[PDB]
Scaffold this active site. Structure first.
Site, PDB file in Angstrom:
ATOM      1  N   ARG A  23     -11.491  32.895   4.128  1.00 36.09           N
ATOM      2  CA  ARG A  23     -12.485  33.732   4.812  1.00 36.09           C
ATOM      3  C   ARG A  23     -12.416  33.649   6.342  1.00 36.09           C
ATOM      4  NH1 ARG A  23     -18.697  35.129   3.919  1.00 36.09           N
ATOM      5  NH2 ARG A  23     -18.078  35.657   5.991  1.00 36.09           N
ATOM      6  N   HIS A  74       2.823   5.364 -20.536  1.00 38.36           N
ATOM      7  CA  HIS A  74       2.298   5.523 -21.910  1.00 38.36           C
ATOM      8  C   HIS A  74       3.009   6.656 -22.667  1.00 38.36           C
ATOM      9  CE1 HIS A  74      -0.633   2.453 -21.101  1.00 38.36           C
ATOM     10  NE2 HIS A  74      -1.731   3.067 -21.558  1.00 38.36           N
ATOM     11  N   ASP A 125      -1.869  12.716 -29.633  1.00 34.66           N
ATOM     12  CA  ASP A 125      -2.270  11.740 -30.670  1.00 34.66           C
ATOM     13  C   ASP A 125      -3.732  11.259 -30.519  1.00 34.66           C
ATOM     14  OD1 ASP A 125       0.441   9.633 -32.083  1.00 34.66           O
ATOM     15  OD2 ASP A 125      -1.284  10.551 -33.101  1.00 34.66           O
ATOM     16  N   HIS A 177      -7.329  19.981  -9.190  1.00 40.40           N
ATOM     17  CA  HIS A 177      -7.353  19.124  -7.984  1.00 40.40           C
ATOM     18  C   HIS A 177      -5.946  18.722  -7.530  1.00 40.40           C
ATOM     19  CE1 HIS A 177      -6.899  14.785  -9.560  1.00 40.40           C
ATOM     20  NE2 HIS A 177      -6.686  15.607 -10.605  1.00 40.40           N
ATOM     21  N   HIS A 197      -4.219  12.716 -24.499  1.00 42.34           N
ATOM     22  CA  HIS A 197      -5.273  13.689 -24.275  1.00 42.34           C
ATOM     23  C   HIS A 197      -5.453  14.481 -25.564  1.00 42.34           C
ATOM     24  CE1 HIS A 197      -7.900  15.933 -21.593  1.00 42.34           C
ATOM     25  NE2 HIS A 197      -7.057  16.967 -21.459  1.00 42.34           N
ATOM     26  N   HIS A 252       0.803  -1.234   0.000  1.00 44.72           N
ATOM     27  CA  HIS A 252       0.000   0.000   0.000  1.00 44.72           C
ATOM     28  C   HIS A 252       0.840   1.291   0.000  1.00 44.72           C
ATOM     29  CE1 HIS A 252      -4.464   0.407   0.151  1.00 44.72           C
ATOM     30  NE2 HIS A 252      -4.040   1.685   0.071  1.00 44.72           N
ATOM     31  N   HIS A 287       4.177   1.038  -1.618  1.00 53.19           N
ATOM     32  CA  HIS A 287       5.227   0.670  -2.588  1.00 53.19           C
ATOM     33  C   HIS A 287       4.737   0.680  -4.039  1.00 53.19           C
ATOM     34  CE1 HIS A 287       9.125  -0.963  -3.762  1.00 53.19           C
ATOM     35  NE2 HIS A 287       9.500  -0.685  -2.498  1.00 53.19           N
ATOM     36  N   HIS A 306      -5.755  -3.123 -20.961  1.00 54.43           N
ATOM     37  CA  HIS A 306      -4.620  -3.997 -20.582  1.00 54.43           C
ATOM     38  C   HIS A 306      -3.704  -3.313 -19.561  1.00 54.43           C
ATOM     39  CE1 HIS A 306      -3.136  -7.935 -22.278  1.00 54.43           C
ATOM     40  NE2 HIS A 306      -2.499  -7.735 -21.103  1.00 54.43           N
TER      41      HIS A 306
END
Length: 153
Positions: free
Chosen positions: A143, A71, A83, A120, A80, A46, A48, A63
């Site tokens: 605030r 990638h 390509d 985010h 995105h 968790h 590594h 896959h």
């Protein structure tokens, strides 16, 4: 006979056999052998790869998804707009250009609501970094510390 060696050779605490076996009797190594072992996975797996999933069990979808197999690199560029977007940008000129030519107007919601989800990476990931530490420090989310008197509203 002699009272000096008859303590160390006669008072010999061999009864401890029953107290060794009392700790093994129900086999606590079987109930607790799980509890120590799940603690090895939550710090050795968790922390590594991610926790017996990496990108989504092993395949994530086709896959390997663009978050493990390297990638391109950033993942949100090559697959995105590089390509992927370029195929609909040049074949149709509305799929990509409808988001690009509208980005000037949609900046009114992208810089407002997208400052939670699009940003985010530093707005919500750190829980502070783009909602109090950046773009919001001066009043627009701070605030409490910069808004003690609310005078911006």
């Amino acid at each position: 006979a002699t009272k000096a060696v008859c303590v160390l050779k006669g008072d010999g605490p061999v009864q401890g056999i029953i107290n060794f076996e009392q700790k093994e009797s129900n086999g606590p190594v079987k109930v607790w052998g799980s509890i120590k072992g799940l603690t090895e996975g939550l710090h050795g797996f968790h922390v590594h790869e991610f926790g017996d999933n990496t990108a989504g069990c092993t395949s994530a979808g086709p896959h390997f998804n663009p978050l493990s197999r390297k990638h391109g690199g950033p993942k949100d560029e090559e697959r995105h707009v590089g390509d992927l977007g370029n195929v609909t940008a040049d074949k149709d000129g509305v799929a990509d250009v409808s988001i690009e030519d509208s980005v000037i107007s949609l900046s009114g919601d992208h810089c407002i609501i997208g400052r939670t989800l699009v940003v985010h990476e530093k707005a919500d990931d750190l829980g502070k970094g783009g909602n109090e530490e950046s773009t919001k420090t001066g009043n627009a989310g701070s605030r409490l510390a910069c808004g003690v008197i609310g005078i911006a509203q």
